[PDB]
Amino acid sequence: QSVCAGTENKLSSLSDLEQQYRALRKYYENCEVVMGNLEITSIEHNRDLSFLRSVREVTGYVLVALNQFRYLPLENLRIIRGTKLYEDRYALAIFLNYRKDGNFGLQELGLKNLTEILNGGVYVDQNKFLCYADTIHWQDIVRNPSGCGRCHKSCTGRCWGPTENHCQTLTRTVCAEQCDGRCYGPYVSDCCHRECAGGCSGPKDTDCFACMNFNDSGACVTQCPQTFVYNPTTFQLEHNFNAKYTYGAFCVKKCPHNFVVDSSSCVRACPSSKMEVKMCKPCTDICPKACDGIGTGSLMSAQTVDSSNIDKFINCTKINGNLIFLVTGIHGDPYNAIEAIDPEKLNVFRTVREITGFLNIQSWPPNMTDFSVFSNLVTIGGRVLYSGLSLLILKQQGITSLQFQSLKEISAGNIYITDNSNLCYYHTINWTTLFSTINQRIVIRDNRKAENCTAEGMVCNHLCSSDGCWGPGPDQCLS
Ligand SMILES: *[C@@H]1O[C@H](CO)[C@@H](O)[C@H](O)[C@H]1NC(C)=O
Ligand SMILES: *[C@@H]1O[C@H](CO)[C@@H](O)[C@H](O)[C@H]1NC(C)=O
Ligand SMILES: *[C@@H]1O[C@H](CO)[C@@H](O)[C@H](O)[C@H]1NC(C)=O
Ligand SMILES: *[C@@H]1O[C@H](CO)[C@@H](O)[C@H](O)[C@H]1NC(C)=O
Ligand SMILES: *[C@@H]1O[C@H](CO)[C@@H](O)[C@H](O)[C@H]1NC(C)=O
């Protein structure tokens, strides 16, 4: 069975309509199970759509709008699950399939095998030249309760096209009262297994056209075989060798390539508040999100953090590169249209736990007394250095304390904390405890005199170790 992903384009199309067609063929040709939506929009009159015969099932919605072809060749389409709906209303939407001043438009629907719409409504409207679809009993299909040709005599006034072989096959409204679902005839012995969607060829869960829920090796089951199965004799949950994950309406021993396991299911990526581990576990800290720093990938050409790039750092926990704050970044670039940074926007770094390169503070908003926006920064990697330095805090008159409360590791490079005239606490810090290697040293010069700090009461809390503090209070200790 061949699987593919849908589109989430709705009415949008490529301006070159031949390209809209090539995209359609590319996305859906040779695909049997659409994991998502089937959107056929803005397709011209003389186009070969016969490749749509590969499709047996759509999980999302089927959208057919603004097209101009005569026939819709979806003859193998058995089921629309309607997991996602068009405008959150329709599983099947067929409209405006005509072009003005040209007797070009949709004439008939090749949907003879379409007998199941699990969720959503049906919307068939304003198709100038569409015939027969008005004779269809959508009540049988949907599980939730101009001058045209005539249906063939045998079709009993319900058909998709004009011949004896275009009749609508009813699989629910023609059943015996006893049936849990669909049927293949009108007798009591003709009921399908309750797990059969579309209909069936016999009474077993292996005789279905499609599955109501999941398909476990040809059998239509309520749920996939679990990791542990109860044993009524031994009274224990025995390990199930047949255990399978859910991949849409399939039960799989192995998820497709690069997919993750979220609560027994195969997903493209972990949901919000969950993290990859390949399984999805709830987040230990703030969910991991690696970001490019100044001079890396997306920010290769960037020189400082500024108003035009600040937002690229929203929810980042790890910075791949550096974090650089220059005068042009803090105070704005008059030589361009780059205005000064909203100092409140620097709060965006409160999610950052790691910086792989260096932290270079050449400028800081003069009303910010500290670096508490970096309160959760655990590591400075120093994988790349600024003249041997991995931490540079230079010439800040506005700063009073550091307040890097989570800073536990400076993996490489030296420290340069200089000419910060009003800065205290720095002298209480035993930098050694943060350094990973012998060569790592500190340049400390012309900050507030340690004696004047003490006299003014800028001292570590009693709870702090001999290692010192980043600022005042008992939340600022090194150990
Ligand atoms: C429609 O469904 C039947 C039953 O699953 C299958 O045999 C057939 O290939 C599809 N039918 C047509 C008429 O294309
Ligand atoms: C279930 O999967 C089997 C593969 O073992 C496939 O051939 C068949 O079409 C599926 N059955 C239904 C009813 O979807
Ligand atoms: C950042 O994550 C929060 C939840 O932690 C979410 O509210 C927000 O929309 C995310 N911001 C962006 C720009 O994606
Ligand atoms: C710091 O000053 C700026 C303007 O220079 C303003 O955005 C900000 O709100 C101040 N921070 C406060 C009041 O917490
Ligand atoms: C500490 O305090 C004194 C006295 O008020 C002042 O001269 C200066 O800020 C400090 N001393 C030195 C040598 O910087």
Short mmCIF file of all heavy atoms in Angstrom, two decimals, residues 264-292:
data_model
loop_
_atom_site.label_atom_id
_atom_site.label_comp_id
_atom_site.label_asym_id
_atom_site.label_seq_id
_atom_site.Cartn_x
_atom_site.Cartn_y
_atom_site.Cartn_z
N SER A 264 2.14 5.68 21.91
CA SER A 264 1.92 4.53 21.00
C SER A 264 1.65 4.87 19.51
O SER A 264 1.41 3.96 18.72
CB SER A 264 0.85 3.59 21.55
OG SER A 264 1.29 2.96 22.75
N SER A 265 1.74 6.16 19.12
CA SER A 265 1.46 6.60 17.77
C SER A 265 2.67 7.12 17.01
O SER A 265 3.54 7.74 17.62
CB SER A 265 0.36 7.67 17.78
OG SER A 265 -0.80 7.20 18.45
N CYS A 266 2.69 6.93 15.66
CA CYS A 266 3.77 7.44 14.80
C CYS A 266 3.42 8.85 14.38
O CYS A 266 2.38 9.07 13.76
CB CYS A 266 3.98 6.55 13.58
SG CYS A 266 4.48 4.85 13.97
N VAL A 267 4.27 9.82 14.73
CA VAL A 267 4.05 11.24 14.37
C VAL A 267 5.29 11.82 13.71
O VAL A 267 6.40 11.36 14.01
CB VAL A 267 3.51 12.14 15.53
CG1 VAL A 267 2.14 11.66 16.02
CG2 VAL A 267 4.50 12.25 16.69
N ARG A 268 5.10 12.82 12.82
CA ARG A 268 6.17 13.55 12.12
C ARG A 268 7.14 14.22 13.14
O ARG A 268 8.37 14.15 12.97
CB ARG A 268 5.53 14.59 11.15
CG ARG A 268 6.49 15.34 10.20
CD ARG A 268 6.88 14.62 8.91
NE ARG A 268 5.74 14.02 8.21
CZ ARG A 268 4.96 14.65 7.33
NH1 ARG A 268 5.18 15.92 7.03
NH2 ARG A 268 3.95 14.01 6.74
N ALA A 269 6.58 14.83 14.22
CA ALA A 269 7.34 15.46 15.31
C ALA A 269 6.54 15.52 16.62
O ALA A 269 5.30 15.53 16.59
CB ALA A 269 7.80 16.86 14.90
N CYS A 270 7.26 15.56 17.76
CA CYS A 270 6.72 15.63 19.12
C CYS A 270 5.75 16.79 19.30
O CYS A 270 5.98 17.87 18.73
CB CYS A 270 7.84 15.67 20.15
SG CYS A 270 8.70 14.09 20.38
N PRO A 271 4.65 16.60 20.08
CA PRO A 271 3.69 17.70 20.27
C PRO A 271 4.24 18.76 21.22
O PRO A 271 5.24 18.50 21.91
CB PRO A 271 2.48 16.99 20.87
CG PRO A 271 3.06 15.88 21.64
CD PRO A 271 4.24 15.40 20.84
N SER A 272 3.58 19.94 21.28
CA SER A 272 3.97 21.03 22.17
C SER A 272 4.06 20.49 23.60
O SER A 272 3.28 19.60 23.96
CB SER A 272 2.95 22.17 22.10
OG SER A 272 3.21 23.17 23.07
N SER A 273 5.04 20.98 24.37
CA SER A 273 5.34 20.56 25.76
C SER A 273 5.93 19.13 25.93
O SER A 273 6.21 18.71 27.06
CB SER A 273 4.22 20.90 26.74
OG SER A 273 3.09 20.07 26.55
N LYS A 274 6.18 18.44 24.80
CA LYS A 274 6.84 17.12 24.75
C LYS A 274 8.18 17.27 24.01
O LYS A 274 8.32 18.16 23.17
CB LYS A 274 5.96 16.08 24.06
CG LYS A 274 4.86 15.52 24.94
CD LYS A 274 4.99 14.02 25.08
CE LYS A 274 3.72 13.37 25.58
NZ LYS A 274 3.83 11.89 25.54
N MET A 275 9.14 16.39 24.30
CA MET A 275 10.47 16.43 23.67
C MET A 275 10.95 15.06 23.16
O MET A 275 10.62 14.04 23.77
CB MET A 275 11.52 17.02 24.63
CG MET A 275 11.61 16.29 25.95
SD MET A 275 12.74 17.03 27.11
CE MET A 275 12.90 15.69 28.25
N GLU A 276 11.75 15.06 22.07
CA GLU A 276 12.35 13.86 21.48
C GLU A 276 13.40 13.30 22.45
O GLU A 276 14.06 14.08 23.15
CB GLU A 276 12.98 14.20 20.12
CG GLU A 276 13.29 13.00 19.25
CD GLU A 276 13.82 13.36 17.87
OE1 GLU A 276 13.05 13.92 17.07
OE2 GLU A 276 15.01 13.09 17.62
N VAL A 277 13.52 11.96 22.54
CA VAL A 277 14.48 11.31 23.46
C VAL A 277 15.14 10.06 22.87
O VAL A 277 14.48 9.24 22.25
CB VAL A 277 13.91 11.11 24.90
CG1 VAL A 277 12.67 10.22 24.91
CG2 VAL A 277 14.98 10.58 25.86
N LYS A 278 13.40 6.75 19.21
CA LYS A 278 12.96 8.15 19.22
C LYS A 278 11.53 8.24 19.76
O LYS A 278 10.57 7.89 19.06
CB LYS A 278 13.07 8.79 17.82
CG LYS A 278 14.50 8.99 17.29
CD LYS A 278 14.62 10.14 16.26
CE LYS A 278 13.80 9.98 15.00
NZ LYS A 278 13.71 11.26 14.23
N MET A 279 11.39 8.67 21.01
CA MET A 279 10.11 8.79 21.71
C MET A 279 9.83 10.22 22.17
O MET A 279 10.75 11.04 22.20
CB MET A 279 10.14 7.85 22.92
CG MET A 279 8.81 7.21 23.21
SD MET A 279 8.87 6.14 24.66
CE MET A 279 7.28 5.28 24.46
N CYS A 280 8.56 10.52 22.53
CA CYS A 280 8.15 11.81 23.07
C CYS A 280 7.88 11.70 24.58
O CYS A 280 6.91 11.06 25.01
CB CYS A 280 6.96 12.41 22.33
SG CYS A 280 7.24 12.68 20.56
N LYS A 281 8.75 12.31 25.39
CA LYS A 281 8.68 12.36 26.84
C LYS A 281 8.27 13.81 27.23
O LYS A 281 8.65 14.74 26.50
CB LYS A 281 10.05 11.94 27.43
CG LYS A 281 10.42 12.42 28.84
CD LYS A 281 10.11 11.38 29.92
CE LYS A 281 10.64 11.76 31.29
NZ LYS A 281 9.91 12.91 31.89
N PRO A 282 7.49 14.05 28.34
CA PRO A 282 7.18 15.44 28.72
C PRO A 282 8.47 16.16 29.13
O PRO A 282 9.39 15.53 29.68
CB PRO A 282 6.21 15.29 29.89
CG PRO A 282 6.55 13.97 30.48
CD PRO A 282 6.95 13.10 29.33
N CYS A 283 8.56 17.45 28.82
CA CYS A 283 9.77 18.23 29.06
C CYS A 283 10.27 18.34 30.52
O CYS A 283 9.49 18.63 31.43
CB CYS A 283 9.70 19.58 28.35
SG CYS A 283 9.61 19.44 26.55
N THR A 284 11.58 18.02 30.72
CA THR A 284 12.30 18.05 31.99
C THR A 284 12.40 19.52 32.42
O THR A 284 11.92 19.87 33.50
CB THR A 284 13.67 17.34 31.84
OG1 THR A 284 13.45 15.96 31.56
CG2 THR A 284 14.55 17.46 33.09
N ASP A 285 12.99 20.36 31.54
CA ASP A 285 13.17 21.81 31.70
C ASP A 285 12.19 22.50 30.71
O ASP A 285 11.07 22.00 30.50
CB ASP A 285 14.65 22.16 31.38
CG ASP A 285 15.35 23.10 32.35
OD1 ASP A 285 14.66 23.97 32.96
OD2 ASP A 285 16.59 23.01 32.48
N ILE A 286 12.60 23.65 30.11
CA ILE A 286 11.84 24.35 29.07
C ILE A 286 12.15 23.50 27.82
O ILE A 286 13.33 23.17 27.61
CB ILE A 286 12.30 25.85 28.91
CG1 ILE A 286 12.11 26.66 30.23
CG2 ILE A 286 11.54 26.53 27.74
CD1 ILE A 286 12.85 28.02 30.32
N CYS A 287 11.13 23.08 27.04
CA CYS A 287 11.33 22.24 25.86
C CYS A 287 12.52 22.63 24.98
O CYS A 287 12.72 23.82 24.73
CB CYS A 287 10.05 22.09 25.04
SG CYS A 287 8.75 21.15 25.88
N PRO A 288 13.37 21.66 24.57
CA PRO A 288 14.58 22.02 23.80
C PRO A 288 14.27 22.67 22.45
O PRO A 288 13.41 22.19 21.71
CB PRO A 288 15.34 20.69 23.66
CG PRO A 288 14.74 19.78 24.67
CD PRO A 288 13.31 20.20 24.80
N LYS A 289 14.94 23.80 22.17
CA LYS A 289 14.81 24.51 20.90
C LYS A 289 16.16 25.15 20.57
O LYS A 289 16.55 26.14 21.19
CB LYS A 289 13.67 25.54 20.93
CG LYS A 289 13.43 26.24 19.60
CD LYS A 289 12.34 27.28 19.69
CE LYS A 289 11.86 27.72 18.33
NZ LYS A 289 10.78 26.84 17.79
N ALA A 290 16.89 24.53 19.62
CA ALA A 290 18.20 25.02 19.18
C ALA A 290 17.98 26.18 18.22
O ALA A 290 17.07 26.15 17.39
CB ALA A 290 18.99 23.92 18.52
N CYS A 291 18.77 27.24 18.38
CA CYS A 291 18.68 28.44 17.56
C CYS A 291 20.01 28.90 17.08
O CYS A 291 21.01 28.65 17.75
CB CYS A 291 17.98 29.56 18.32
SG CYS A 291 16.19 29.35 18.47
N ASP A 292 20.02 29.61 15.95
CA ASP A 292 21.22 30.19 15.38
C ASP A 292 21.50 31.48 16.10
O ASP A 292 20.59 32.28 16.30
CB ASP A 292 21.02 30.48 13.89
CG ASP A 292 21.08 29.28 12.99
OD1 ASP A 292 21.71 28.26 13.38
OD2 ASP A 292 20.53 29.35 11.87
#
